[PDB]
Amino acid sequence: SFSVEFKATENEIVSGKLDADTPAFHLVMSDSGEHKGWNVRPTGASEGGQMVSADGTRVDLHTNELSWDNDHWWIDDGSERVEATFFLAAGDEVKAGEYQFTGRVEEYVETVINSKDISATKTVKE
Amino acid sequence: FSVEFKATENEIVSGKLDADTPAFHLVMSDSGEHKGWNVRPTGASEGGQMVSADGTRVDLHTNELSWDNDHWWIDDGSERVEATFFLAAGDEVKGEYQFTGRVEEYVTVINSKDISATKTVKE
Numbered sequence: 001s002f003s004v005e006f007k008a009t010e011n012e013i014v015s016g017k018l019d020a021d022t023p024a025f026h027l028v029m030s031d032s033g034e035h036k037g038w039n040v041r042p043t044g045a046s047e048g049g050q051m052v053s054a055d056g057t058r059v060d061l062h063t064n065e066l067s068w069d070n071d072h073w074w075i076d077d078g079s080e081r082v083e084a085t086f087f088l089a090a091g092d093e094v095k096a097g098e099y100q101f102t103g104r105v106e107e108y109v110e111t112v113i114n115s116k117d118i119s120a121t122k123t124v125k126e
Numbered sequence: 127f128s129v130e131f132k133a134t135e136n137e138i139v140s141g142k143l144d145a146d147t148p149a150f151h152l153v154m155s156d157s158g159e160h161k162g163w164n165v166r167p168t169g170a171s172e173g174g175q176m177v178s179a180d181g182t183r184v185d186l187h188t189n190e191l192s193w194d195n196d197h198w199w200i201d202d203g204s205e206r207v208e209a210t211f212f213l214a215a216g217d218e219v220k221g222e223y224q225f226t227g228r229v230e231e232y233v234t235v236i237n238s239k240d241i242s243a244t245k246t247v248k249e
Contacts, residue, residue: 017203048157050157057204057205058205092203093202094204095204095206
């Protein structure tokens with residue numbers, strides 16, 4: 001009954017300084033079974049909380065739906081479904097590229113009971 | 127803050143150049159808040175030049191960075207910026223050429239580091 005969906009968002013991003021908080025990824029973590037909360041842990045290139053392009057350029061990710069603890073996002077949410085959007089901050093100077101985020105989702109109980117890798121790429125146009 | 131500076135891989139042979147020829151590659155990166163970067167030639171390289179053991183001075187050029195009298199600079203807030211320094215076409219080149227410089231990150235310089243690399247022009 002545990003499922004995750006992680007996709008790049010539909011909004012178009014162009015290189016240059018962002019006027020506004022700009023959506024990049026959307027995440028959905030589901031389970032109707034009893035649980036305490038979730039972890040979203042960056043992996044590989046994306047460690048630190050970044051999306052990373054082919055040449056290695058990094059862009060920080062932010063979410064208003066999840067808390068952060070040193071190196072990963074977390075939330076105590078026992079509902080059947082949690083959603084989170086990861087956005088780029090306003091004022092960030094972003095270069096063109098195909099930026100990939102990799103990470104591992106973890107469901108925990110009042111102890112991790114389910115985990116799964118996520119991976120998505122968002123385009124920044126020139 | 128990280129800096130990477132190296133000779134390019136293309137072979138250069140002595141004589142007078144036809145087109146523009148890559149000589150070095152530079153990567154300046156920092157995840158911290160910043161306004162831009164300076165690349166300041168130091169030592170024998172002052173003037174923006176690579177210099178061989180016999181004292182032959184060859185001009186460097188870049189289309190990725192701006193120039194201001196005696197140094198390159200760029201306003202770039204992104205986490206990472208790359209530059210290729212090339213020799214101009216029509217330049218006579220004779221050895222082992224060293225460029226020495228200092229990379230600076232500014233907002234006021236908040237990080238800096240010496241860079242050095244040697245490029246071979248063969249007979």
